[PDB]
Design a protein around this ligand. Structure first.
Ligand SMILES: *[C@H](CC)[C@H](O)C/C=C\C/C=C\C/C=C\C/C=C\C/C=C\CCC(=O)O
Ligand SMILES: *[C@H](CC)[C@H](O)C/C=C\C/C=C\C/C=C\C/C=C\C/C=C\CCC(=O)O
Lengths: 297, 297
């Protein structure tokens, strides 16, 4: 069974990594690019970008542990723990050469530690729409002069007593539509049909729980990154952020400048959080061009 | 019929104010003191203080519009709109003398405008455990290095699509227990019976909605208060806040200093948000002593 339709010429497959069965979709030829999705979604957020990248790269898009069709992690959900799975997965397909990385939302949290600990393995890096977990997140406001802030879900999802699963179970499709659209500028790309696909996936009980365990580990990830950040990233990096409702605006680049020696950033107007879907044409162009500066098929 | 047991010597009654039938519990003799409850609760949070105050004052404890047994407002839920109902209710019982006011949590939001606009009507003022709505609330953090913050409910409750009603319906007792205990230092004061009573009251569909409409009007209340705050409060004021988990600490008095010329403050160590229940005896003492400096029975 497949939760989302595989683009023509791609394969849906699984690979056991440290006892955890990870789902991924792979296609193309050439140097490897790994694309890592975020909360509320799966590999499928990349499905429009993947055929274009596969003209020049081998493309792999895994489901994060516990999400999509991937088994939950056996170690834990902190960034350093999850990054081991993703690093080992990528290195199975690119054992002798560095690979490229594109990551969205908590995909950043789940890859930053393996990037900084294995810098020679990462040729080029693209990060979009999430802070790297550090002390800056403790200053984000709970409430804004416009109304509800974009990050109160940090506390909701991290709350104990399984608060979020208990309130959202049985209402997953309602919650996800509200959550996605509230973080979007171009909301009407989120058709009922597309929302149905995403909601059915994260409504699996272990996936609903996995979704929130990433946030229950957020403070641990901050503590991990306080040590890791003592070494700046040396590879070429690009940040993308939405400029519209739901977008991180200038924060994405400004934080990354503290982490990376070589970074360029873009803010996409009229685009919110969900860049691959809200603003596919400019986002895909920016990613393809940036990765194509390095060698490719 | 009664949602909560009435203390001996008190009467549960109703008055129509601007076409809205307000419920209150009243007893005692002497100058009037009005006690105004906050979110998650009703007049009943005052039921231990009421008989002690009734020895020297006429005591009235209304249910906020839409909560407990009070009808929803017919104008709206902003602080200025709700304060009209509370002011006119108090004036029905104290038309010829200024009256005292004690307010907790959103009881502050719903009384501050009528205090600043009718200062000659307010003899003494006691405010506990809530910010007056102003720009300071936009600095409260969404997330903390210890887990969920105390203020992310501002955004949860203000969100549209009836997000809070939809997620909490069928789980009203579960949510309220979690919410109360996460804002408490002393959780043992919240018995099964007490939580049952509060949960059944705010679970009434119109009361569940009313609870969150106060937050959907919060930014409007902020904007209203920006104009009202040009006039400082001149009457004797006391602030109270918890010093334990859930408490506002020094914020309560420090904010009130910008609003009131004559203010004294206390922080109660070992107490959280729910001061009348978590720390009934010292809270009662400080309120009674502060109000008894003025002319009473
Ligand atoms: C996934 C979310 C679905 C992760 O949990 C969180 C990742 C991103 C959160 C989405 C948006 C965050 C929005 C802004 C927070 C940072 C500040 C923005 C800086 C300047 C923009 C100006 C402004 O609008 O205030
Ligand atoms: C009713 C809540 C049930 C109202 O919606 C909110 C009123 C207050 C909630 C309780 C506390 C949070 C309020 C504002 C936070 C302000 C400052 C907190 C700073 C430190 C004091 C103690 C601490 O948290 O360490």
């Amino acid at each position: 069974a497949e939760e989302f339709p595989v683009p023509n010429g791609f394969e849906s497959a699984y690979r056991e990594v440290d006892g955890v069965k990870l789902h991924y979709v792979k296609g193309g030829q050439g140097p490897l690019v790994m694309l890592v999705h975020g909360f509320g979604q799966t590999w499928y957020e990349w499905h429009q970008l993947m055929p274009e990248l596969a003209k020049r790269f081998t493309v792999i898009a895994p489901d994060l542990p516990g999400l999509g069709q991937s088994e939950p992690p056996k170690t834990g959900y902190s960034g350093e723990q999850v990054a081991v799975y993703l690093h080992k997965l990528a290195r199975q397909f690119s054992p002798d050469r560095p690979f490229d990385l594109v990551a969205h939302d908590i995909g950043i949290w789940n890859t930053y530690p393996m990037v900084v600990k294995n810098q020679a393995d990462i040729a080029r890096l693209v990060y979009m729409q999430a802070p790297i977990p550090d002390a800056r997140i403790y200053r984000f406001p709970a409430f804004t002069a416009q109304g509800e802030s974009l990050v109160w879900h940090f506390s909701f999802f991290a709350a104990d007593d399984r608060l979020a699963e208990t309130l959202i179970a049985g209402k997953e499709r309602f919650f996800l539509e509200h959550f996605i659209k509230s973080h979007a500028s171009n909301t009407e790309v989120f058709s009922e049909r597309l929302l149905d696909l995403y909601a059915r996936s994260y409504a699996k009980p272990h996936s609903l729980n996995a979704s929130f365990e990433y946030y229950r580990a957020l403070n641990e990830s901050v503590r991990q990154n306080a040590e890791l950040a003592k070494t700046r990233l040396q590879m070429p990096t690009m940040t993308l952020a939405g400029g519209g409702h739901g977008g991180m605006g200038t924060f994405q680049l400004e934080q990354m400048k503290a982490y990376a020696e070589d970074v360029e950033g873009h803010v996409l107007p009229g685009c919110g959080h969900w860049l691959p879907e809200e603003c596919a044409a400019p986002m895909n162009r920016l990613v393809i061009d940036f990765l194509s500066r390095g060698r490719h098929h």
